[model samples]
Each structure stands twice: as structure tokens, then as C-alpha cells.
Target: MLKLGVIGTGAISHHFIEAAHTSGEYQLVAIYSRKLETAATFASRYQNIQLFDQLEVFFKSSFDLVYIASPNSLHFAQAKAALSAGKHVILEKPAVSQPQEWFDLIQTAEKNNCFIFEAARNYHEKAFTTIKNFLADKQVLGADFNYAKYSSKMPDLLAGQTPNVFSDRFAGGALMDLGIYPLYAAVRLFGKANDATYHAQQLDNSIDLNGDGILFYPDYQVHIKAGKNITSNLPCEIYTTDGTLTLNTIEHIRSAIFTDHQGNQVQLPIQQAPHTMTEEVAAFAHMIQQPDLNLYQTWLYDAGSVHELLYTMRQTAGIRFEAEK
Candidate 1:
């Protein structure tokens, strides 16, 4: 089993640990937090682990794998530290705000003979492959992707408090965090867009509250919208001359259905582990063991392309993070 260290103590960290525990592919070895008290509290439920508040001490641990679920601005730096220590890394979604950061991370991983995976649950789902294959021969005419969650922090933001979800310093905003799902989905499904544009609403601090964008392809236009200030139940759909393939959400991808012109629907249910993150964790572990260079390169390419598209979209929307400056 691969030994693992975690670098965040948030709820997402709990989710990852639960999923990794279910997979039986990794051993809980250590945890690191900026606060010893927080790390100790988080490590209390797990057995046989070490906890560290200092990043340098955390790097000295013997774990072969490190999972990073820190805030957006910290992913590149923490992942860099882990790779520098010759440890494989699983970084949470929106792994790096800047495209160059991802390229640099890839280069570092290559030099260290380690791998870094962006922990995107949807990518590991079998439904993703199913949708890809289904669209391979079909002519995609257009698509709509939406992920709008009414953020709990919206109230806080309105109260004149800056939660991490609304703080540009932490790379927090609707686009960099929530919008990433549809952004990545569009990129992976269609390759880079020929042209992309975005219009966003921002708070007083210039952080995006919500945004919508259009990505132009050869024959299709993808419309994507994401926000933390709203809730949307509209499923993502890819259209063709004959039919449409529907996905419930871009986050976990609960279901995938292909509907014919006559309205006959075929359900394509992906078999996945119970926890939403389990499959990605398992896939990460398997990748580490087998080490397919082609797959590694492909994953990095996808991430890099998504980053470039998102950066352009954000710039057009007038959303800028301090990290980029």
C-alpha cells in the first residue's frame, strides 16, 4: 500500500481520507496544517499517523504520496514542495490558478520521477469516457454546461466579511473555484476553443460573484455559466443533429443519459465507489504504481489547456487574482 500524507485539514481533506480509506490503496501516514491544534484534532480519529504544523517537517515524513486540499493560491507551492521531496501528489481541483504554474509543476514532477494528479472526480468517472466515446462519431452542434451553487458564504460576503470563498488573495471567486468544472469539461470535451469570451458580475473587492462565457468551436458553441450566488438544476447537455447526451452535474457526474431524437433515453450509469472521490483516489494510486508516461502526459496536457482557457476567460471578465500579478 502507498503511504500518504495530507496537507490540509478542511472538510475536503476529510472526504479524501474517507475515500482513500475505502479504496484500500493508501495508508494514512501523516497530516500537516498551519496550526498544530487543527492538525492534531483532524488526526485524532485516524490511527497510526504523525502531524506537523511546519511545512519543512511535513516534507521530511516518509510518505510516498501527498494529498493537497489547501486553498487555491497554495496548491502550486505545496505541490512543488512535495514533488521536490520526491513524493507523488494529488492536488484538489483548480490545482493551480496560473497555466505556467501547472507547466512548472509538470516539469518538476518529471524531474523527480513523481506524478501530480488534479483531483477532479468527474475525470475518473467511467461516464466521462462513455460521454467521450458517444460524442466521438457524432457531430456536436452545441452544448450548455452550468454549475451554480448558492454558496453558504454569500451571506458572509454580504455582511462585509471576506470568507475564503470571496477572497482574491486566496484565489477565491466563482470562476476560479466553481466555474472550473464546466471550464475543464468544455476543454476536455472539445479541445481548446477557437474563441472564448466571458461576462461576469463582481463584488466590491473585484471578485467574481457569477459569470457566463461562450466557447466557439468549429461547428459548435459551448455555453457555460457558474456562480456561488445562485443555484441551478439545469443539467449539462451536448447537442447533435440527432440527439443529446445529458450529464447531471460536472462535479460528481451523478448520471449520464443519451436521448434520441424520438426522446428514447438510454441510461449510461457509471459504476463507481460509494464515495464521490473514491474513484479518483483509486485511479491516482493505480497511476503511481503503473506509471504510464503517455497517460501522464495526456493528463498534464488537458490540465494545461484548461488553465489557458480559464485564464483568458477570467481576463476578459475582468477577474484578476493577486497570484497572477
Candidate 2:
């Protein structure tokens, strides 16, 4: 089993822990939190787990991998440090505040001969691979993807309180949090867009509350909408010359329906165990232990492309984070 360490005491970190347990491919070795009490609370549930509140001490500990679910602004630095210390890293979504930070992390990983993975669940799912294969030969058209959830913290934001999800200090916004799902789906399916444009509904803090953008390709256009102040039940649709595929959600992608020109319908369903991130955990472990060059290269390409797209979209929408500098 690969020795594992975790950073952060957030819900996402707990998800990763449970996933790792399900995979049975990792040994829970250490946990780090800025607050010692929080780290202690987290480690209390696991036997023989070390807890650290200092970054330097945590880095010095022996572990094969570090799972980072820290806030958005800290992802880049923490991942870089882990890689530099010769430990593989699995970082949570919106991996870094900027594209350049991702590029730098890639370089550090290469130099240290350490593996780095974005803890993005959808890409590893069968549904995504199935969709990619299904669209390979089909003539493409326009697409629309929507992922919006009314943030529970919206009331606090309205009362002029900034939680981590709405804080400029942490590179937090609708795009960074909720928008990434559709953005990843769009880029993963269509590759990079030739041109992009975005219009955002901003909060008083200049953070995007809702963002809508269009990605222009040679033969198709993709419309994406994401928000934190509203909820949407709209299905994500991909239109082609022959038919359209509709999905209830982009992030999980449990089910899909395709209707052809003749109105013949096909069902494509993905079976996933509830509340388990088994696929992602297994995939990341395989990548690290097996060491396939082709797989690593593909991951690197996809990560770079997505980060570049995110940077462009944020720039176009005028969503600036103080942490970016």
C-alpha cells in the first residue's frame, strides 16, 4: 500500500479519506491542518495517524503521497511543496489560482519524478469516456451545459459576510467552484476553443455570482452557464448533425439520452456506487504505482488545456482574485 498523507479538514478532504479507505490502496499515515485541534479531531478516527499543524514538519514526514483538499489559493503552493519533497500529490478541483501555477507544478513534478493528479472525478468515469467515443465520428454542432446550485452561504454573503466559497482571498467564485464542472466537460469533449467570451453577474465584492460564456469552435459553439446564487434543473445538451445527447447533470453524468434525426432514442447509463469516489482513487493509485508515460502525458495535456481555458474565461469576465498575484 502507498503511504498517504492528507491536508485540510474540510468536507472534501473527508470524502477523499473515505474514498481512499474504499480503495484499500493507501495507508493513512499523516494529516495536516493549520489548527492542531482540527487535525487531532480528524486523526482520532484513524489508528496510528500522525497529525501536524506545521507545514515544515508535515513535509518532513515520510509518505508516498499527499492528498491536498485545501482552499483554492493554497493548492498550487501546497502541491508544489509536496512534489519538491519527492511525494506524489492529488489536488482537489480548481487545482490552482492561475494557469501558470499549474505549469509550474507540472515542472516540479517532472523534476522530482513525482506524480500529480487533479482530483477531478468526472474525467475518470465511464460516462465521460463513453461520450467521447460516441462523438468521435459524429459531426458536431452546438452544445449547452448548465451547472448551478444556490449556495447555502448566499445568505451570509448578502449579509456582508464572506465565507471561503465567496472570499476573494481564497480565489473563490462561482466559476472556480461550480463552473469548473461544465468547463471541464466542454474542453474534455471538444478540445480547446478558437475563441471565448463571457458575461458575468457580479457581487459587490467583484466575485462572479453567475457566469455565462460561449466557446467558439470551427464548426460548433458551446454555451455554458454556472452560478452560485441560483438553482437549475436544466439538462446539459450536446447537439450534433444527426442527434442530441441530454444529461441530467454534468458532474456525475449518471445517465444520458440520445435522440436521432428519426426520433429514435438510445439510453446510455453509468453505474456508480453511491457516495464513493472509488474510480478516481483507484485510477490515481494505478497511475502512481504503474507509471505509464502515455497516461501521464495525456493527463498533463488535459490539465494544461483546462487551466488555460479557465484563465481566459476569468480574464474575459473581469473576475480578479487578490490571491492570483
Candidate 3:
């Protein structure tokens, strides 16, 4: 049984913590927050969770790995501290905003022999493998892929704003938060894009209201569309000369169908493995047990490539975080 420590008691932490508790394969050993009250509340909600206000105390506890669900900016610092204190980590999305920062973290984890798996829910699913296999058959799906979306639905908050996700402080907007899903999905099918271009519309304090770009590879083209202000009901499809592969659930769920030119439609049932979070958590637990650089290289390669494109896209839109720049 793997003992896990959770750093941060926020909305995002619930997905991981709640899922881990029900997994029955992991022991939720520790919970951390700057405020003692928050930590206590979060820890008390679950069974056998020890709350910690001090970072050192949490680190001293015997946890096989720590899951960091802090905001986008604090991932590196928190992971550094946890690794230095001799614990592995499962960091939440956009693990690092810059490509160099990703390289630095990967190197540091390598030096310390600690595992660092970026928490991307969809990437861990069995459906992801199914999609890749379908794409692999060039004779069937030829190699033209297109995907896009927008996910900044902040209609409830007063003044039409809820959190900083769409704001500039968190180094996010529709592109990084929502666009990442399409980027990861496209990259999984078409590896290591050689060239790319990004365009965006900026709002107050350099927030990206809308962003779109195209990733270029040797034999394929990937078009990514995303927005914070607007919403797209566009279909996510992979086009070929002979037929088309359509995915029903583009971002969260991976279910699809294949349509041929002859009007033959085949429904491809992708086996859903629990929930997306469950798969990622399981992968993180496995990686923490055997920290290998070769495996990390593959994960990091995909992570760094997409983040670099995102940063460049934000730059094209004149979106630069004051602290980051």
C-alpha cells in the first residue's frame, strides 16, 4: 500500500484526495495547508488523514509520495521542497509554465531519484491508447487531425468573475487551462511537432480571451482552438481521404465513431477506466515506486513540448505574467 501526502486543500485537491480514498490501494497519510483550520477541516473530512500546518512536519512523516494540488505558479517550489525532503511528487497540471523550468524540475528529480508525474487526467486513460492505435493505421485514418474548444465558464461569480483562472496572476486563461487537453490529445497521436504558430486575443491585464494555433508535424497537421470569453460547439474529428474518426467526448471522456466515405459508420467503444483522475493517480503511484529517467524522459518530452507552445502562444497574444516575465 502506498502512503500519500496531499499538499493544498483547495477545490482541485478534492478530485485527487476523494479518488485516492476510494481507490483502496492507497493510504491517505497526511494533509497540508498554510492555515491550520483549512488543513484540519480537509483532514477531518476523510479517514486517517493527519493534518499539518508546518511543512517540515509533513515532510518528516512517512509518505511514499506527495500530491501537490497548488495553483499553477507554486508547483515548482512545492515540488522542490518535497523532493529535497526526500519524497516523490505528483504535480497538478501545467506543472511548469516554461520549458526550461520543466527541464530543471526533470533534472532535479533525476538527481534526487524522486518521481514527478504531471497530473494530466485524460492522458492516463485506456481510451488514449485506443485513440493512438486507431490513428496508427495510416491506411485507415490517413493523418489529418483537428481539435479545439473553450472552457472558462465564469457566469456565476459577481461581476461575471469567479476565480483567477481566467485572470492573469495564475499564468492561465482558456489556452493553458482548456487548450492543454487538445494539445495533449493531438500530441499523443502525432509525436513531437516540428513547427507551430499561435495567435490569441488579450483582455485586461494580459488575459487571453481567445487563442488558436496550428501545430505542424512531418506527415500531419494539428489545429487547436480555445477561448475564455466564447464557447465552441465544434466537433472534434480526425480526417482522412477515405474516412473520418469522430470523438464524442473530446476533453473529459474519450468515446468515438468511425465513418467511411461509403456511408458505413462503425462505433468504436473505448473502454473507460474508472474516472480520468483514478488512472492518473494509479500511474503516479506506480512511477513513485520505480523512479526511472528513461520513462520520465517520454513523459517530460510531451509535457515540455505542449507548455512551450502555450507560452509562445501567450506571448504572441501579448499575454505575459508580470512575475513570470
Candidate 4:
């Protein structure tokens, strides 16, 4: 098992720690937080886990991989630092604000003979592959993917406080945090879009409260709807000549339901692990243990594709992040 340390103690970080431990391929060895008390409390459930308050000291310490769950703007720097320190980096969603940052990180990792993974957990789900296979050879008409859950931090934002998840300084907004899921499903299921247009709502911060993005393909277009202040229970739909397929949710798809023109409904088998993040952890471990196989290149390519799409959408929507373009 590769020795793993993580930064951040947020909810998603806790999920990653749980999945990493259960994957049987990663060992939780350390955690880093700005405050020692935060790190201590977060690591209390585990025994003999090291903790650190300073990032420089944590990165310099012995660790095989670093799972960075820091803010959106911090991903590039933190991952580059981990790579420079000769540690594999597993970055959470919205890996970097732009493709250039991703490219720089890749170059840094290559110089250190290390690996970088974008922790887009949905991309590695078995159901994601199942849906991909189901769409094979089908004449795709288009798709509409939606992933919107009102942020618990919205109240804080309404209260005139800047939560990290909704702050332009932290590269926080609807599209970066939640909209990435639908966009990932779009690019992962289909290829790159010929063009993308995002009609978003924002105030002075360049932060989107809600938005609708249209990804234009050669034959059809995929629509992505995401929000930070709205709640949606709508399932994503894929339209094809053969039929239409509906999944419970594109973010953590566990089942895909297909309905033919004749009105026959059939369920696509998509068995998922108990933990939502297990498959991604396992996949990362495989790449780490088998660098010769070079699966990291493929993952990086897809991540780059999505990054380009994201950049296009954000630019069209005029969404700004603290990171330089």
C-alpha cells in the first residue's frame, strides 16, 4: 500500500480517507491542516496517523502520495509542490482553474517521475463505463446533464460572509464545484465539444449562482444545467436514435434506464461499491503500482479535455477566478 497523506478536513476529504482505507491499496499516514486542533480532531478516528500544521513541512516529510482537497485555487500550487517533493498527487475536482495549470503540473510531475490524478470520482465509476458502452455506436441526438444541490454555505453567503466554496478569491462558484460533474459526463461520454456557451448569472464576484451551458458537437449538442442556490431532483437524459437513457444522477450514477421507441424499459447493470470514491482510489493505486502501463496518460488526456471545455464555458460566462489565465 502506498503511504498517503492528505490536506483539508472537509466532508469530501473525509470520504476520500474512508475510501482510501477500504481500498486496501492506500495507507492513511498523515494529514495537514492550518490548525493543529483541526488536524487532530479530523485524525482522531485513526490510530498513529501523523499530523502537520505547516504545508512546507508536510510536503517535505516522507509520503508516497498526497491527496489534496484544498480550495479550487490551491490545487495547482499544492499539487506542483507535492510533485516537486517527489510525491504522487491526487487532486480533487476542478483540479485546476485552467488547462495551463494542469499542463504545468504534468511537466512538474514528469520531471520528478511522479503521477498526478484528478479526483473526478464520477469518471471512474463502473456505471460511467456502463453508460459509455451503452451509448456505443448509437446515433446520439444530444444529452442534458444536471447536477444542482443548494450549497449549505449559501446562507453564509447571503449573510454577507464569503465562504470558501462561493468566493471568487478561492475560485469558488457553481460551475467549478457542482457543474463540473455534468460537464465531465458530457466529455467523458462524448468527445470534445466543437464549442461551448454558458449563460450564467453572476454579480460582481464573477461567481455563478446558476447557469446553463450548451456544448456544441458536430451532430448535436449537450446541455448542462448547474446551480449553487437551487435544488434539483432531475435525472440526466441521453437522447439517441435507438432510444433515450436516463440515469439517476450523472455525478454518482448507479443505474441507467433505457427506454426504446417501442416503449420497453430496460435497466443497465451498474453495480457500485459501498463507498462512492472507492473505484477512483483503486484506479489511482493501479496507476501508482503499474507506471509502465501508462494509464495516467489517458486519464490526464481526458482531464485536459474537460479542462479545456471548462475554460471555454467559464470564459463565455465571464466567470473569473483568482488564478491567472
Worst lDDT window (10 residues) for model 2? 269-278
lDDT agreement with native, every candidate: 0.86, 0.86, 0.74, 0.88
Cα displacement (angstroms), candidate 1, residue 127, comes to: 0.4
Query: lDDT by residue for model 1 over 1-325, one digit each (tens)?
Result: 9998998899889989988888889888999999989998999999978989899999987999999999888999999999999999999989998889999998999899899999877667666777888789888999999889899887887888999878889887888888888877887678878888888899776788888999889988999898899888998999988899888877677788889999999887655457778778878888888877898788888888778878888889878776555
Q: In candidate 4, which residue pairs clash? A: none
| TM-score of model number 1 | 0.96
Q: Which residue runs does candidate 2 get wrong by more than 4 Å?
A: 323-325
Please give the distance, in angstroms, between residue 132's alpha carbon in candidate 2 and its true position after superposition.
Answer: 1.3
Model 3 misses residue 173 by how many Å? Answer: 0.9
Please identify model 3 stretches exceeding 4 Å from their true place: 139-162, 290-294
Supply the global lDDT for candidate 2. Answer: 0.86
lDDT by residue for model 2 (1-325), tens: 9999999898778888888987889888999999989998888878999989998889999999999998998899899999989999999998988888888998999999988898877767768888888889888899999889999898998898898888778898888898888877887788878877777998666788998988889988999898999998999999999999987787777788899989999887667556546778889998887878897888777877777877888899888888554
lDDT, residue 142, model 4: 92
Instruction: Predict model 3's lDDT versus the native.
Output: 0.74
Backbone clashes for every candidate come to: 0, 0, 0, 0
Output the TM-score of candidate 2.
0.96
Better-scoring candidate (lDDT), 1 or 4 = 4
- Candidate 4 matches the true fold with a TM-score of 0.97
Instruction: Output the better candidate (2/3) by lDDT.
Output: 2
